[PDB]
C-alpha cells in the first residue's frame, strides 16, 4: 500500500506534491552528473 494504492485512495493531492522550487532544486542535479561525466571522460571539443 505504498505506490498505486496511495493514488487510488486520493492521498496524492495538489498539496503534498513537491513544489516548483523543490523540483528545480532536484532538477539542478542534472547538470552535475553531465559535468561529472564530461570531467571523467574528457571528450574535448566533441560537440559536433
Amino acid at each position: 500500500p505504498i505506490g498505486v494504492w496511495s493514488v487510488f485512495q486520493g492521498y496524492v493531492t495538489p498539496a503534498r506534491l513537491p513544489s516548483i522550487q523543490t523540483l528545480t532544486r532536484v532538477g539542478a542535479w542534472g547538470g552535475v552528473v553531465v559535468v561529472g561525466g564530461l570531467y571523467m571522460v574528457q571528450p574535448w571539443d566533441w560537440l559536433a
Binding site: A28, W29, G31, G36
Partner: protein, 59 residues
C-alpha cells in the same frame, strides 16, 4: 581575522549543485599545473639523455 567574502560565498558556496562543477574545473586546472611542473623539472634535469633529444639532434 581573515574571513571569506559574503558575495563570493553567495555565488560559489551556498549550493552544492554550483559548488561541484566549480570543484571539477579547479581539479582539472590543478592537475594540469602539477603535470606541467613535474614534466618541466624532469625534462630540464635530464636534458640530452632522452630519446627525443637524440631525434631532434639528428634533424
Amino acid at each position: 581575522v581573515m574571513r571569506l567574502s559574503e558575495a563570493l560565498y553567495q555565488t560559489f558556496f551556498k549550493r552544492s549543485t554550483v559548488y561541484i562543477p566549480m570543484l571539477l574545473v579547479g581539479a582539472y586546472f590543478s592537475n594540469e599545473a602539477i603535470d606541467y611542473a613535474v614534466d618541466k623539472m624532469w625534462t630540464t634535469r635530464n636534458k640530452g639523455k632522452l630519446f627525443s633529444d637524440i631525434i631532434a639532434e639528428r634533424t
